[PDB]
Structures are given as structure tokens and as C-alpha cells.
């Protein structure tokens with residue numbers, strides 16, 4: 001199978017995701033619509049159900065709406081059963097139309113469809129070459145009040161119909177009872193309730209098992225990707241452990257939502273994208289794009305700066321999911337925002353690095369500020385808008401041109417309003433020119449690119465006032481970039497030498513199968529390198545010119561670079577691949593009497609790669625927490641660690657460059673074969 005095929009569940013770099021609120025798209029089956037005060041046929045009260053379902057999505061796939069648009073993947077609302085109760089917030093009636101108020105993760109939402117309808121969605125989608133990504137929110141259940149069991153459904157959780165427990169009289173401790181978060185710190189937002197939503201205690205063995213079992217169900221049904229909700233509100237450790245169980249079963253592209261207000265670098269966000277095992281929604285990319293094209297609060301330099309900065313911060317920048325807007329912010333289009341600006345933002349996103357996602361209705365210039373106005377019903381299915389055209393012409397390029405899907409990014413020409421960047425992967429090139437100025441054209445001179453000698457036509461065909469250019473060994477002849485113009489020029493050819501464009505997933509234990517996408521691998525099975533270790537023969541389950549499926553070797557756990565050798569020639573190295581010791585379990589390390597100095601933090605390290613292999617650098621675990629579950633001088637932290645292994649570890653204090661280790665002998669602990677555990681020790 002090509003890296004391009006719909007069967008590639010491990011990489012979305014060549015795809016274009018279409019995010020849609022199932023309820024607000026198309027009601028293909030009115031028979032499953034809710035009744036009473038929870039429904040609104042006219043869909044004017046955006047807090048109620050409008051009727052949209054999976055049958056509606058099926059209908060639009062069959063009548064080629066998505067195929068003509070060019071999108072190759074659908075990101076739908078959480079498919080699990082949500083609460084049925086209606087909630088009254090200060091006079092206004094609220095429903096679980098969004099799918100975020102789950103009550104049973106092992107059953108479907110009857111309003112969206114039956115288990116059979118879902119299977120029908122998967123089948124119909126894969127037939128037309130479209131992948132299905134689902135929303136999954138393992139952080140909480142639904143709104144709840146501990147003192148009032150009559151409010152909503154008391155955040156009750158069900159296991160395929162069987163009641164597990166509710167928020168009140170939670171003797172088993174399935175949920176956190178530490179009040180609501182004030183968002184003052186990372187720790188505060190992880191162990192306290194997100195508003196009134198009942199927060200799960202993933203340290204509980206039953207809850208841990210439940211989510212591993214629950215996700216396997218949906219994976220087994222054929223889902224191609226997972227968008228994890230509120231990753232910033234659950235321990236990285238548990239999530240990493242959960243992630244490894246998924247990758248050991250049926251690996252699929254997984255990304256999470258870690259909200260960011262600006263394009264500025266955030267330490268915790270970067271660590272998560274680099275250490276969790278999943279990528280993230282690129283909010284930094286989003287901010288820059290909006291500041292420049294929408295709000296006019298930044299110029300083209302802020303755009304180039306963001307490109308360079310994110311490529312530096314994230315180990316795998318191509319795995320970050322880009323977008324111009326979504327359900328968490330105001331629609332890109334506003335009366336003060338021109339159609340051309342939205343169109344340019346799209347063109348930019350579609351030709352830039354990462355995995356592009358389009359919020360439903362963007363092609364129809366849908367407006368709407370804040371929740372719930374930004375989740376209005378699809379106004380029409382017109383295929384004649386300029387935005388629709390841009391997407392249908394640029395989206396396919398992610399499949400046909402590897403420069404756009406796997407390439408690096410380099411600035412070629414720039415000023416306050418003009419931006420010319422180049423995507424390059426091997427001998428394939430793509431050059432995009434953008435002039436955000438709506439009234440003045442720009443005279444471009446001295447433009448140098450990697451385009452071979454020849455005449456290039458605008459891939460957009462001039463719909464965005466693009467023009468044709470002429471190359472003479474890279475040097476482009478002088479031309480005028482029209483007002484509000486944006487053009488795309490490309491060049492593609494076959495690769496003779498091996499070039500790795502993507503590896504998915506980037507974390508796993510020996511025995512797992514990983515996918516390597518690229519160009520020039522040849523038909524004859526060669527050899528795959530994980531550092532120095534060579535993998536050949538049966539270990540390589542599949543080998544083609546554009547994709548290689550290989551089994552992770554039994555080597556020491558650690559960070560490795562991946563390389564491919566075909567016909568004696570070595571390819572480029574794909575860095576930062578994490579090999580685990582084996583199966584993972586989440587363990588809470590608790591240390592008592594660890595009093596510190598001002599600005600001094602407590603960290604943890606031990607004899608396994610998951611603990612940093614006695615390192616005190618960035619691979620060490622920490623800084624530890626000391627406010628919610630346990631209070632200072634007691635510290636704690638949830639860590640994904642190998643199952644059934646005898647571990648040795650020690651805590652250490654670190655302020656500046658001074659390290660203070662625990663005295664005495666190392667602490668020891670044998671981890672459980674599965675689930676979770678808590679190990680408490682005293683600072684030596």
C-alpha cells in the first residue's frame with residue numbers, strides 16, 4: 001500500500017481533515033432525533049440537538065460532497081453514549097449535542113446512530129478513500145454536584161449498561177473530590193474538576209482498565225485516528241501508559257488538545273508533544289495565522305518566526321494538527337474580515353507543514369462568535385464558492401507532492417505583507433507566494449528558489465489572482481504579485497535514493513509494528529536501522545517504494561534514530577524514536593519529608609529509560625507536584641513505567657545547576673503486571 005492510501009492509519013501528513021460537529025451537519029435519519037425540549041427542528045437554539053447524525057455524513061460521502069471538496073479524513077464528535085438529562089444553566093437549557101458529556105464509553109450515542117450505523121460509516125468512508133477520526137474525552141464524564149444527586153445525571157459512568165458509579169457516594173474513589181480548578185497551575189488543572197465536570201481518578205485500577213478496554217472497542221471497529229480531549233488536564237504519565245497500550249494493539253494517529261493563547265513557545269506544551277506519545281493541535285500556528293490574516297495585529301515576519309520556532313521546539317513538527325479556527329474560538333470569518341483573507345489563510349494552511357484540519361462550513365464562509373454561535377448548522381452544500389475551489393485544488397497536492405506532505409520549510413522572500421516560502425523533500429519542490437495586502441501589488445525581484453529551469457503554472461489556476469513564472473536554475477524572472485494574490489508553483493519527480501518522510505508512531509515496545517513513509521525505497525526488501533541495530537528479513541513485515549512496515553527490535557530502551565538502507569545507500573535519519581522497556585503501567589511515586597529551598601524543585605530518576613536511566617537532565621521525571629493529592633513537604637508524580645519490573649530509584653533536588661541527591665541506598669519497587677500502583681517512601 002502507498003503511504004497515500006486510506007489504509008495508512010499511522011500517518012495523516014498526506015491528508016486534509018474535515019472537523020465536523022455531527023449534530024450540526026446533516027440529519028439523514030429523523031427517526032433517531034431526540035424528542036421534547038431537547039430538540040429543535042429549526043436549529044435556532046444552538047444549545048439543543050438539531051438532529052445531525054451518522055446517516056447524514058454517509059449521505060454526503062455518497063453524493064461526493066467530500067470527494068469533490070478534496071478532504072480525505074473526517075474528524076467527528078465523540079461517538080459514545082452521552083447523558084440524556086437536560087441541564088439548566090441560569091435559565092438556558094443545555095444538551096449534550098457536542099458529545100463531551102459521556103456516560104457510557106462502550107455504547108454509541110443513539111442520536112448519532114446505532115453500532116451498525118457506525119460500522120456503515122466506517123465502511124462507506126473507507127470505500128471512498130476517507131479516514132475516520134473520533135473525538136475521545138477520557139478526562140471526565142458529565143456535569144455533577146456532590147451535594148445534589150438530582151442535578152444532571154450525577155456524572156454517572158456505565159460499563160456497557162452496567163452502573164460503575166456516580167459522583168455522590170463514590171466510596172471506590174473513581175473520581176477526584178478536590179473541588180474545581182482555578183487554573184492557577186498545571187497541577188491544579190489536572191487533579192481538580194474542569195468546571196462541574198466529574199473528574200476521573202485514573203490512578204484507580206478499574207478506571208485505568210476501563211479506558212484501555214473502551215478504546216480497543218472503537219479501534220476494533222476500524223477508526224483511523226483519535227483526537228484526545230483536554231490532554232492538559234490529565235497526567236502525562238497515565239496518558240503515555242494509555243498510549244502505549246493503543247500502539248501495542250492497533251496503532252492509529254493520535255493527537256490531543258492543549259490550549260494555548262498565543263504563538264509563543266510553552267515549555268509544558270512542548271514536553272507533552274515530545275514525551276506523551278501523541279502530537280497536538282497546533283495552537284501556536286493558529287495564533288500566528290489569525291494575527292496576520294484575520295486580525296492584522298502582526299505582519300509576515302511573525303508568521304516566518306513561528307514556522308522556525310515550532311520546527312525547533314517540536315521533535316516531529318509534521319505531526320502537529322493545523323487549523324484556522326475551531327469550536328474553541330470565534331469563526332475566522334467576520335463582517336470585518338474579507339473573503340480573500342480567509343482564502344489566503346486556507347491556502348497557507350493547506351500548503352504548510354503538519355496535518356491540516358478544516359472546521360466544517362469554512363468553505364461556506366460560516367460566521368459565529370463564541371460558544372455556541374460558532375457551532376451553527378451547515379447553511380448549504382454549494383460547491384461553487386472560491387473557498388471550496390481553493391481546497392479542492394490544494395488538498396490533492398498533499399497526496400501527489402511529497403514536498404508538501406513531508407518537506408522542510410524555507411523563507412525565500414519576505415516583507416511586512418509579502419511571504420514567499422519553499423517546501424522541499426528530495427528533488428520535489430513547492431513554492432508558495434502570498435500578498436496579504438488587499439489594495440497594492442508587489443514587484444518581486446531577486447527571487448531565488450530550488451525550482452529547475454522551466455515555465456511554471458499556478459496550481460490554483462489564477463483563482464486567487466496567481467500568476468505564472470519562469471525559472472532559470474532557481475532564479476525566477478521579475479514579476480508582479482497582484483493585490484491579495486497567492487500562487488502555488490511545484491515540481492515533482494521520482495526519487496532514486498531512499499528518503500524518510502515520516503515514521504508513525506514514534507514510541508513503542510519491542511514487538512510493535514511501525515510505519516515508515518517516504519520515497520525511493522525500491523521494490524527489493526533492504527534493511528532498517530534502529531540506531532546501530534539492523535532489522536532484516538521476517539522482522540520487516542512489508543516493503544514498498546513509498547512505505548515500510550517493520551517490527552521494533554529487542555534492544556535497550558532509549559532514544560533512537562531511524563534509518564533505511566536500500567541497495568547499499570543509506571537514507572536520512574529520522575530522529576527521536578522512543579523504544580520502551582516493555583508494557584507500561586502507571587505508578588504514583590510519593591515521597592515524604594522532602595523540604596526544599598526557595599525555587600528548588602524535586603525530580604525523580606531510576607534504572608530504566610522510562611525514569612531517565614539515572615539522568616538529571618531533561619529525561620528525568622519532574623518537577624514533582626505538591627499541592628492537590630498530597631501537600632508539601634510531601635511530593636508526588638504519576639509516571640508511565642514498565643510492567644512487572646524491579647525498579648531502583650532516587651529523588652533529587654535541583655534549583656539552578658546544583659544537584660542534591662537522596663543519601664543512603666536506592667529505593668526499590670517491583671511494578672504490577674498490569675493496571676496502576678502507588679509507592680510511598682521517605683526522603684533519605
Ligand SMILES: OC[C@H]1O[C@H](S[C@H]2[C@H](O)[C@@H](O)[C@@H](O[C@H]3[C@H](O)[C@@H](O)[C@@H](S[C@H]4[C@H](O)[C@@H](O)[C@@H](O[C@H]5[C@H](O)[C@@H](O)[C@@H](S)O[C@@H]5CO)O[C@@H]4CO)O[C@@H]3CO)O[C@@H]2CO)[C@H](O)[C@@H](O)[C@@H]1O
Pocket residue numbers: 089090094098100137143194195196197229230232257258259327328371
Ligand atoms: O461557573 C458556572 C458556569 O456555568 C455555565 S458554563 C457551561 C456552559 O454554559 C455550557 O456551554 C457547557 O460548556 C461545555 C461545552 O459546550 C462543551 O463543548 C465542552 S468544551 C471543552 C473544550 O472544547 C476544551 O477546550 C476544554 O476547555 C478548554 C477551553 O475551551 C479553553 O478556552 C481553555 S480556557 O482551556 C480549557 C481546557 O483546556 O474542555 C472543555 C470540556 O470538555 O464542555 C463544556 C463544559 O461542560 O457546560 C458549562 C459547564 O459544564 C454558565 O454558562 C457560565 O456562565 C457559568 O460561569
Ligand SMILES: [Ca+2]
Pocket residue numbers: 027028029030031032033051052053111
Ligand atoms: Ca437524526
Ligand SMILES: [Ca+2]
Pocket residue numbers: 139189190191192199200233234
Ligand atoms: Ca483531570
